[PDB]
């Protein structure tokens, strides 16, 4: 099962002393009402952000702990054994057994820390291992200890898990030894409000955000709060999802164009600023081979690409295999060079159905012989001749290596945005930028064809046109507002009625809606009573009793 921890995990925040001081601080705390696993039955604890370890036993059942990820030669680990004479810490990645029982260079010995309560804290903070110790004699009671610091080692090793150690008087199943109880609480960065009495010790602690009462106490930095209305924080609606949006994109002529150019006169076109038309028939998209690195479909939501580069050349069938990264031979050197970190996608397909001619096609040429490899991105307009050049033979009776092939390489240089859209929900809207948060509803705005977007007073835009289907949306910054905590005073009770400012909770105890917003935790009565705590927009409060 599980159980809640009432008031465990309190200690001096700064490891420094103050006299008669009330004071609110944030540090690596055990949050109030945190989970601990009762281990009472007729055990490995992960070290998440610090372990608060409590033990209840008449005698010394626990022998120590074995910290470390794997406790092997290649994994750094740690052993602590707390004997009645001395406590020994060995941080040397020693090998430990799976079932604990008792009969490198590092080594450490220090004084022993001591129906019996023993509390300890292991903390892995800022490359430092902090140890706190405490021993006292004895539903969870409210047991309190201002846990003074004991040790802070500056060494950092991979500590993730540890387990208690048990050693019997004699063994090889075995004797019916007692079942000790220990609670583990994972530490979390949290802030509290403490009170230190005149003698100077921690005596009263309040979580800053346990309750609206707890929050108003943490606001006033105190522990007695009068009857009234107090303002603590604000309810901000989480902006659900982020929706990103982008007069025709000329993708059709990049691959499906009837005629292409030769290798030397490679064609490069940047395509953007248009509705992405990818549905135009090219080859019925029979994509059986695909693997691209650098660009992924996931990032198109949070990545906008700057340019689309297309490079084209002409080769034959039995040589497409040799055109790849890490390929050698005369084909790649004299036709096209592939970079090591090529960022793009490889598209290769058959083109015999379109490039077939009864009399033969001589419009596809390639350079097979040259003095040297062409430089990258080199431009040459010379017509000097080295028949010197051979054209591909395209016959139906030849082999599969004589088939015509159109090969084009697409690259993305990062020296266009992503689709998707939602409506009527407080979300993060982006349209090639314009990063805003709010509700996009049906817009009472009607624009002119170039009127891309509109603005209200105080430079807060009102409408957005859809780059895809060309519709206009109304934007209101997200529905949020403060919170006021009607509290009738800790002297009387601890019942809080919290009002959200200017938010309709009909569209996000009994919940009432007033002109000022959404009053939850208040049983809206209709009766007439004199006002004590004005709640807002003409409504007040009273205590039912």
């Amino acid at each position, epitope marked *: 099962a599980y159980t809640n921890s009432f008031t465990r995990g309190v200690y001096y925040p700064d490891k420094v002393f103050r006299s008669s001081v009330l004071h609110s601080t944030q540090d690596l705390f055990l949050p109030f009402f945190s989970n601990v696993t009762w281990f009472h039955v007729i055990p490995v604890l992960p070290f998440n952000d610090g372990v608060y370890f409590a033990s209840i036993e008449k005698s010394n059942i626990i022998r120590g702990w074995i910290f470390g990820t794997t406790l092997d030669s290649k994994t750094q680990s740690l052993l602590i054994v707390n004997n009645a004479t001395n406590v020994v810490i060995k941080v040397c990645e020693f090998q430990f057994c799976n079932d604990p029982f008792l009969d490198c260079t590092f080594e450490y010995v220090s004084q022993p820390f001591l129906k019996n309560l023993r509390e300890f804290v292991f903390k892995n903070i800022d490359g430092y291992f902090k140890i706190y110790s405490k021993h006292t004699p004895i539903d969870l009671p409210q047991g309190f200890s201002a846990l003074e610091p004991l040790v802070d080692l500056p060494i950092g090793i991979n500590i993730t898990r540890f387990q208690t150690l048990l050693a019997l008087h004699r063994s090889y199943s075995g004797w019916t030894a007692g079942a000790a109880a220990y609670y583990v609480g994972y530490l979390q960065p949290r802030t509290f409000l403490l009170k230190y009495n005149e003698n100077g010790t921690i005596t009263d602690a309040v979580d800053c955000a346990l309750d609206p009462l707890s929050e108003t106490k943490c606001t006033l930095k105190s522990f007695t709060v009068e009857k009234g209305i107090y303002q603590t924080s604000n309810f901000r609606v989480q902006p659900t999802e982020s929706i990103v949006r982008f007069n025709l994109c000329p993708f059709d002529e990049v691959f499906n164009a009837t005629r292409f150019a030769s290798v030397y006169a490679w064609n490069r076109k940047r395509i953007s600023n248009c509705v992405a038309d990818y549905s135009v028939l090219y080859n019925l998209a029979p*994509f*059986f081979t*695909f*693997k691209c690195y650098g660009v*992924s*479909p996931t990032k198109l939501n949070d990545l906008c690409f700057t340019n689309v580069y297309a490079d084209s050349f002409v080769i034959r069938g039995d040589e497409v295999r040799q055109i790849a990264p890490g390929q050698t031979g005369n084909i790649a050197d004299y036709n096209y060079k592939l970079p090591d970190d090529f960022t793009g996608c490889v598209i290769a397909w058959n083109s015999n159905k379109l490039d077939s001619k009864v009399s033969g096609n001589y419009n596809y040429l390639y350079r097979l012989f040259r003095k040297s490899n062409l430089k990258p991105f080199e431009r040459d307009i010379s017509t000097e001749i080295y028949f010197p050049l051979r054209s591909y033979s395209f016959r139906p009776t030849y082999g599969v290596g004589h088939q015509p092939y159109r090969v084009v390489v697409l690259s993305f240089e990062l020296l266009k945005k992503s*689709t*998707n859209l939602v409506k009527n929900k407080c979300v993060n809207f982006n349209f090639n930028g314009l990063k805003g948060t709010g509700v996009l509803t049906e817009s009472n705005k009607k624009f002119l064809p170039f009127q891309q977007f509109g603005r209200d007073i105080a430079d807060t835009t009102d409408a957005v046109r859809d780059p895809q289907t060309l519709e206009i949306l109304d934007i209101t910054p997200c529905s949020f507002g403060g919170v006021s905590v009607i509290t009738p005073g800790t002297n009387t009770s601890n019942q809080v009625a919290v009002l959200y400012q200017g938010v309709n909770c009909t569209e996000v105890s009994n919940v009432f809606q007033t002109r000022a917003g959404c009053l939850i935790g208040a049983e809206y009565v209709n009766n007439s009573y004199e006002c004590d705590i004005p709640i807002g927009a003409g409504i007040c409060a009273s205590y039912q009793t």
Partner: antibody
Amino acid sequence: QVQLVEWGAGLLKPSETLSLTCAVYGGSFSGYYWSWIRQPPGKGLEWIGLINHSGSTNYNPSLKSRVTISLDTSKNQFSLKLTSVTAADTAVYYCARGLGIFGVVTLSDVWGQGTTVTVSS
Amino acid sequence: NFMLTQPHSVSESPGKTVTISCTGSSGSIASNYVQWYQQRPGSAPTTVIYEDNQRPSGVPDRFSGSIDSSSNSASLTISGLRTEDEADYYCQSYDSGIWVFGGGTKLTVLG
């Protein structure tokens, strides 16, 4: 998050057509290849087809002669047709989204529940 | 002439890591995607694998796959095993534009 559901007649007979309907919840059809996935129980799958926002579709050759997919942006729904159902047609069917290149449907990244469509005559 | 072969029986105790492969038969398995599936009793597999190494939103981050070119074989791996994942896993590959499936793997969590 987007939720995809399927519902239709689960008792079929030989020689008529399979009809199944899918509705989308909290999603858009922009830049997705919505597809249907089929598997006779106990045995392996037989992928049905695909469709994107503009409606460009690709089918398995074993089903192209018998399968048809349609998209409805007005009703925010897309349905499946499969004609001449046989003993091999007895299977569960789902609708699902997709993310790929021009019809690579391999991240219908939400598990489908679907119905049980059986031929019983 | 693509053929897809997967191990008949793979067993794993809960909490440990288990992997299921789909060995390529004809050609180099790198060119063609091999997608790893899951079939609950009375259910059918879906499509969750593309580029073989990514995990999307709405699906647990534990289902992981891989294709290794050295042994010309695929792999689907589970790290955070749970008893709910009792599902028959099948592999599907592309055979020169033909969608060809495999025999599949029956996965059971030790109870």
